[PDB]
Design a protein around this ligand. Structure first.
Ligand SMILES: O[C@@H]1[C@@H](O)[C@H](O[C@@H]2CO[C@@H](O[C@@H]3CO[C@@H](O)[C@H](O)[C@H]3O)[C@H](O)[C@H]2O)OC[C@H]1O
Ligand SMILES: [Ca+2]
Ligand code: NA
Length: 132
């Protein structure tokens, strides 16, 4: 998976750098893309060296789930700074993807990102939004 990436271009969830998960799989999507799924509560997924430049204050992910769930977005490590939490309610199916966004604290420079899952969700991709 890429050693580094831009926060303001699409990051593919399936191109993660490490995970604690023993269940997570790379899945396909209806339009023949890929994502991550078979995720459980407590699973973490790390993406290395994301460059936030002069600042990001939002996070958007394209996700599908049948259960209400949340994803913490942390900087640097699973116990690093909580940037924000994306709350995802049911999208209607494991294959019905929806772009969902949340606010985060402003982050600058280069940091690993860790997504921390409280339950099952399929994630295709994500991206950050710049501060004003
Ligand atoms: O070709 C694509 C298929 O591979 C794709 O299959 C889906 C893959 O993800 C599955 O989602 C899991 C369902 O079970 C939950 O408990 C897990 O947490 C989910 O990750 C989904 O159910 C499959 O249908 O579908 C799209 C096809 O184009
Ligand atoms: Ca993807
Ligand atoms: Na394992």
């Amino acid at each position: 998976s890429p050693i580094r990436r831009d926060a303001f271009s699409i990051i593919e969830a399936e191109e993660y750098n490490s995970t604690n998960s023993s269940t997570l799989q790379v899945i396909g999507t209806p339009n023949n893309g890929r994502g991550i799924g078979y995720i459980e509560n407590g699973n973490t997924v790390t993406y290395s060296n994301i460059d936030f430049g002069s600042g990001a204050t939002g996070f958007s992910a394209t996700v599908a789930t049948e259960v209400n769930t949340s994803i913490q977005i942390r900087s640097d490590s699973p116990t690093g700074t909580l940037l924000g939490t994306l709350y995802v309610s049911s999208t209607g199916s494991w294959n019905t993807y929806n772009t969902v966004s949340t606010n985060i604290s402003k982050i600058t420079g280069v940091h690993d990102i860790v997504l921390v899952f409280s339950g099952p969700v399929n994630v295709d991709n994500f991206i950050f939004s710049r501060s004003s």
